[PDB]
Every structure is written in C-alpha cells, then in structure tokens.
Amino acid sequence: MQFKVYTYKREGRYRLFVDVQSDIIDTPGRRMVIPLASARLLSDKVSRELYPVVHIGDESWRMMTTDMASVPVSVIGEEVADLSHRENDIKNAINLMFWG
Amino acid sequence: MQFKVYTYKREGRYRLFVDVQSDIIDTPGRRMVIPLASARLLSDKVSRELYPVVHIGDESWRMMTTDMASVPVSVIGEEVADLSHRENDIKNAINLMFWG
Ligand SMILES: [Cl-]
Ligand SMILES: [Cl-]
Ligand SMILES: [Cl-]
Ligand SMILES: [Cl-]
C-alpha cells in the first residue's frame, strides 16, 4: 500500500522498503518501492531533498530514492511502519530524481 | 543521458532500457532506467498511458514502466536510440505510476 514500510523476506542490500506506487495503479504480483538504509553510517552532507531522513524503530533511516525498484509480492514481509506523514518529502525526492 | 536508449551488457529479462534520470541529478556509477520489451507478443489491451509504445530498430516496443530500476554504469552498453521526442508520454506514464 502506498507509503507503508515493509521488511524484505529475502537477503539483499537493504532490509526495509517504502511502497511508493499509487493504490489505483494495478501491477499484479509486484509493487514499486524505495529501499531504506540505516542513516547511522550514511554521510550527513548527502542531499536530504533527494534522500529524505525518516524515523522507524527509534532510529534514523535514509530513503535510497535512486535505488528504487519493483519487488515481487512473494518477497514482501511484515508491514513495520507508515510514512504517509512524509508524503510531501517523498513526492519531492521522486520528482527531483526524474524532473529535477 | 535522460531519454537515450541503451543495450544491457549483461543477460536479464530485457535487452534495452531508456534512461529516465534527470541530467542534473548525479548518482555516481548508476542511472535510473525503464526497460523496453518487444511489443510483438505483449497484449494490445495493456494501458498505453502506463506502458507507452515506442519505435526502435523498425519494430514496436513497450516501455515497462513498472519494471523501473537502477543499472550500474558497468552494464550500460551502446546507445541505440533517442526517445526525447516521447518525453510527454514518458513523463505521463511515470507520474501515473506514483501519483495516478
Ligand atoms: Cl542498512
Ligand atoms: Cl519520519
Ligand atoms: Cl523483449
Ligand atoms: Cl517512438
């Protein structure tokens, strides 16, 4: 569901993603997602406009906007958070990536 | 470069992609891309708004908008075409995917 945050069931670079596909856009068996990376190590100067900072599980995370990818529904795990309250910064970051 | 079409150097689901990242958005070593699939078999009723039909190498191709992904520059092959003349339908398809 748009702006809900889930765990990957499968091993990869990242452990969380935010679903960014519209809820009225039907892709049977897949969703378009932006992975989240722990900010803990991630460099502070990195653009917050292109890479928003979000708060999940009492820690800071970077939205890895430029690692956006489709995930099959088979690998979508537990829903862990909702980022709909960050819709503005998510929209701004995606629109910057394509249209600057 | 935004809206240029390239071959993948590596085997995968698709053989071509269109670069859709802004030219003023710097992701060292990667670009955001939408793969192209031969329309030849692809079903005619499929939304042309979400999945535009483009013409390359004297054949029709479907822009697989919902398979958008980052590709490392190491796997970017020859530039084969330019789709900047389809910027309007590409923009419309991406904006529909996220914002309907
Ligand atoms: Cl991480
Ligand atoms: Cl937040
Ligand atoms: Cl194909
Ligand atoms: Cl065309």
Author numbering:
A (entry chain A), B (entry chain A): 1 to 100
Please give me the paper's original passages concerning this structure.
The primary experimental system utilised is a 101-residue homo-dimeric protein, CcdB (Controller of Cell Death protein B), which is a part of the toxin-antitoxin (CcdB-CcdA) module involved in the maintenance of F-plasmid in Escherichia coli. To understand the structural basis of stabilization, crystal structures of three CcdB suppressor mutants, namely, S12G, V46L and S60E, were solved. The structures of the S12G, V46L and S60E mutants of CcdB were solved to resolutions of 1.63 Å, 1.35 Å and 1.93 Å respectively. On similar lines, in this study, the crystal structures of CcdB mutants reveal that the suppressors S12G, V46L and S60E possess novel hydrogen-bonds with water molecules or adjacent residues, that were absent in the wild type protein and are likely responsible for stabilisation of the native state of the protein by these suppressors.
The structures of S12G, V46L and S60E consist of a single chain in the asymmetric unit, with two chloride ions. Subsequently, another putative global suppressor S12G was identified by analyzing saturation suppressor libraries using FACS coupled to deep sequencing. S12, located beside R10 and E11 on the exposed loop, is involved in hydrogen bonding with the cognate antitoxin CcdA. The suppressor S12G alone is 0.8 kcal/mol more stable than the WT, and the double mutants are apparently 2.5–5.0 kcal/mol more stable than the inactive mutants. S12G shows a much slower rate of unfolding. A cluster of water molecules at a hydrogen bonding distance from G12 stabilizes the loop and anchors it via interactions with the backbone atoms of neighbouring residues reducing the average B-factor in this region. These two water molecules substitute for the hydroxyl group of both the conformers of serine in the WT structure. The CcdB positions 10, 12 and 46 are involved in CcdA binding and mutations at these positions as well as the nearby E11 residue will affect CcdA interaction and conformation of the CcdA interacting loop from residues 8 to 15 (8YKRESRYR15).
